[PDB]
Design a protein around this ligand. Structure first.
Ligand SMILES: [Cu+]
Length: 178
Protein backbone atom coordinates (compact mmCIF):
# COMPACT_ATOMS: atom_id res chain seq x y z
CA UNK A 1 0.00 0.00 0.00
CA UNK A 2 1.28 3.35 -1.07
CA UNK A 3 0.87 6.24 -3.45
CA UNK A 4 2.85 8.73 -5.50
CA UNK A 5 3.30 11.83 -3.32
CA UNK A 6 5.50 13.96 -5.65
CA UNK A 7 4.14 14.72 -8.21
CA UNK A 8 0.70 14.47 -6.54
CA UNK A 9 -1.21 11.46 -7.78
CA UNK A 10 -4.87 11.85 -8.35
CA UNK A 11 -5.56 9.60 -5.39
CA UNK A 12 -3.40 11.68 -3.08
CA UNK A 13 -4.97 14.88 -4.53
CA UNK A 14 -8.29 13.37 -3.28
CA UNK A 15 -6.89 13.05 0.26
CA UNK A 16 -5.61 16.61 0.02
CA UNK A 17 -8.96 17.99 -1.13
CA UNK A 18 -10.75 16.16 1.70
CA UNK A 19 -8.85 18.62 3.92
CA UNK A 20 -9.70 21.76 1.89
CA UNK A 21 -13.21 20.96 0.55
CA UNK A 22 -14.40 18.55 3.30
CA UNK A 23 -15.41 14.95 3.23
CA UNK A 24 -18.69 15.14 1.22
CA UNK A 25 -17.53 17.61 -1.48
CA UNK A 26 -14.20 15.76 -1.92
CA UNK A 27 -15.92 12.37 -2.13
CA UNK A 28 -18.39 13.73 -4.68
CA UNK A 29 -15.39 14.58 -6.89
CA UNK A 30 -13.09 11.57 -6.23
CA UNK A 31 -15.17 8.88 -4.48
CA UNK A 32 -14.10 6.93 -1.43
CA UNK A 33 -10.38 6.96 -2.21
CA UNK A 34 -10.15 10.24 -0.30
CA UNK A 35 -9.81 8.20 2.92
CA UNK A 36 -7.36 5.64 1.55
CA UNK A 37 -5.18 7.04 -1.24
CA UNK A 38 -2.73 4.15 -0.60
CA UNK A 39 -5.25 1.52 -1.71
CA UNK A 40 -5.50 1.79 -5.54
CA UNK A 41 -4.69 -1.92 -5.80
CA UNK A 42 -5.46 -4.27 -8.68
CA UNK A 43 -4.04 -7.28 -10.46
CA UNK A 44 -0.45 -7.03 -11.75
CA UNK A 45 0.64 -7.80 -15.32
CA UNK A 46 -0.12 -4.44 -16.91
CA UNK A 47 -0.46 -3.81 -19.82
CA UNK A 48 -1.17 -7.37 -21.17
CA UNK A 49 -3.18 -8.05 -18.01
CA UNK A 50 -4.21 -5.99 -14.99
CA UNK A 51 -7.30 -3.78 -14.51
CA UNK A 52 -9.50 -3.52 -17.62
CA UNK A 53 -9.87 -0.48 -19.84
CA UNK A 54 -12.08 2.17 -18.18
CA UNK A 55 -11.01 0.79 -14.75
CA UNK A 56 -7.32 1.71 -14.81
CA UNK A 57 -7.47 4.82 -12.64
CA UNK A 58 -9.45 3.02 -9.87
CA UNK A 59 -7.57 -0.27 -10.36
CA UNK A 60 -11.05 -1.78 -10.76
CA UNK A 61 -12.22 -0.40 -7.39
CA UNK A 62 -8.99 -1.16 -5.63
CA UNK A 63 -9.86 -4.85 -5.23
CA UNK A 64 -12.86 -3.86 -3.13
CA UNK A 65 -11.07 -1.13 -1.10
CA UNK A 66 -12.44 1.92 -2.92
CA UNK A 67 -15.22 2.69 -5.44
CA UNK A 68 -15.01 3.63 -9.16
CA UNK A 69 -14.80 7.43 -8.66
CA UNK A 70 -11.30 7.76 -10.10
CA UNK A 71 -12.49 6.35 -13.42
CA UNK A 72 -14.40 9.47 -14.40
CA UNK A 73 -12.60 11.22 -17.23
CA UNK A 74 -13.21 14.63 -18.73
CA UNK A 75 -10.99 17.45 -19.83
CA UNK A 76 -12.02 19.55 -16.81
CA UNK A 77 -12.72 17.07 -13.99
CA UNK A 78 -9.31 16.70 -12.37
CA UNK A 79 -6.76 19.09 -10.86
CA UNK A 80 -3.69 19.41 -13.09
CA UNK A 81 -0.23 20.26 -11.85
CA UNK A 82 2.50 21.73 -13.98
CA UNK A 83 5.36 19.55 -14.97
CA UNK A 84 8.22 20.25 -17.37
CA UNK A 85 9.19 17.71 -20.07
CA UNK A 86 12.43 15.84 -19.49
CA UNK A 87 13.78 14.17 -16.41
CA UNK A 88 11.46 14.27 -13.42
CA UNK A 89 11.35 12.47 -10.13
CA UNK A 90 8.46 10.33 -8.86
CA UNK A 91 8.42 9.69 -5.11
CA UNK A 92 6.17 7.10 -3.48
CA UNK A 93 4.90 7.25 0.10
CA UNK A 94 4.32 3.74 1.51
CA UNK A 95 1.99 2.77 4.35
CA UNK A 96 3.14 -0.83 3.76
CA UNK A 97 6.34 -1.11 1.62
CA UNK A 98 5.99 -4.62 0.23
CA UNK A 99 8.64 -6.66 -1.54
CA UNK A 100 8.85 -5.22 -5.05
CA UNK A 101 9.56 -6.64 -8.50
CA UNK A 102 9.36 -3.41 -10.55
CA UNK A 103 7.82 -0.06 -11.13
CA UNK A 104 6.72 1.08 -14.58
CA UNK A 105 5.59 4.46 -15.91
CA UNK A 106 3.45 5.40 -18.89
CA UNK A 107 2.23 8.70 -20.37
CA UNK A 108 -0.75 9.45 -22.56
CA UNK A 109 -0.08 9.72 -26.28
CA UNK A 110 0.09 13.04 -28.11
CA UNK A 111 -3.36 12.56 -29.60
CA UNK A 112 -5.18 11.04 -26.59
CA UNK A 113 -8.81 11.90 -25.83
CA UNK A 114 -9.24 13.47 -22.39
CA UNK A 115 -13.03 13.02 -22.53
CA UNK A 116 -13.10 9.23 -22.83
CA UNK A 117 -12.42 6.49 -20.31
CA UNK A 118 -8.73 5.61 -20.01
CA UNK A 119 -7.59 2.68 -22.13
CA UNK A 120 -4.19 0.95 -22.57
CA UNK A 121 -3.87 1.99 -26.12
CA UNK A 122 -3.82 5.67 -25.10
CA UNK A 123 -0.59 5.14 -23.02
CA UNK A 124 2.99 4.55 -23.92
CA UNK A 125 5.72 3.20 -21.72
CA UNK A 126 8.29 5.81 -20.73
CA UNK A 127 10.37 4.00 -18.14
CA UNK A 128 10.77 0.80 -16.15
CA UNK A 129 12.56 0.54 -12.77
CA UNK A 130 13.74 -3.04 -12.02
CA UNK A 131 13.90 -4.09 -8.43
CA UNK A 132 15.60 -7.05 -6.77
CA UNK A 133 12.59 -8.19 -4.65
CA UNK A 134 13.60 -6.22 -1.59
CA UNK A 135 11.12 -3.85 0.08
CA UNK A 136 9.75 -0.89 -1.92
CA UNK A 137 11.33 1.69 0.33
CA UNK A 138 14.84 0.65 -0.64
CA UNK A 139 14.10 2.79 -3.78
CA UNK A 140 11.59 5.56 -2.86
CA UNK A 141 12.16 7.94 -5.79
CA UNK A 142 12.52 7.17 -9.49
CA UNK A 143 14.02 9.32 -12.28
CA UNK A 144 11.89 9.00 -15.34
CA UNK A 145 12.18 10.85 -18.63
CA UNK A 146 8.85 12.44 -19.52
CA UNK A 147 8.59 12.91 -23.35
CA UNK A 148 9.35 16.44 -24.63
CA UNK A 149 7.23 16.10 -27.87
CA UNK A 150 3.87 16.89 -26.27
CA UNK A 151 2.14 19.58 -24.19
CA UNK A 152 -1.06 20.42 -22.37
CA UNK A 153 -3.13 17.99 -20.39
CA UNK A 154 -1.52 14.54 -20.08
CA UNK A 155 -1.78 11.66 -17.58
CA UNK A 156 1.23 9.91 -16.19
CA UNK A 157 0.44 6.43 -14.94
CA UNK A 158 2.73 4.91 -12.36
CA UNK A 159 2.50 1.22 -11.63
CA UNK A 160 4.06 -0.56 -8.64
CA UNK A 161 4.24 -4.39 -8.93
CA UNK A 162 4.41 -6.42 -5.68
CA UNK A 163 6.95 -9.25 -5.95
CA UNK A 164 5.21 -11.90 -3.80
CA UNK A 165 1.53 -11.46 -4.67
CA UNK A 166 -0.58 -11.09 -7.81
CA UNK A 167 -1.20 -7.39 -7.03
CA UNK A 168 0.00 -3.98 -8.22
CA UNK A 169 -0.83 -0.37 -7.35
CA UNK A 170 -1.97 2.01 -10.09
CA UNK A 171 -1.61 5.76 -9.66
CA UNK A 172 -2.61 8.19 -12.34
CA UNK A 173 -1.21 11.70 -12.25
CA UNK A 174 -2.91 14.65 -14.03
CA UNK A 175 -0.35 17.03 -15.49
CA UNK A 176 -0.09 20.12 -17.57
CA UNK A 177 3.00 19.54 -19.65
CA UNK A 178 5.28 22.57 -20.00
CU1 LIG B 1 -0.12 -3.08 0.70
Amino acid sequence: HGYIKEPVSRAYMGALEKQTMGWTAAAQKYGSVIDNPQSVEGPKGFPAAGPPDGRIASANGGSGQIDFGLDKQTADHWVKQNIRGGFNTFTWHYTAPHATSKWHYYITKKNWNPNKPLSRDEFELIGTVNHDGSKADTNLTHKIFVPTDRSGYHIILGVWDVADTSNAFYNVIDVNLT
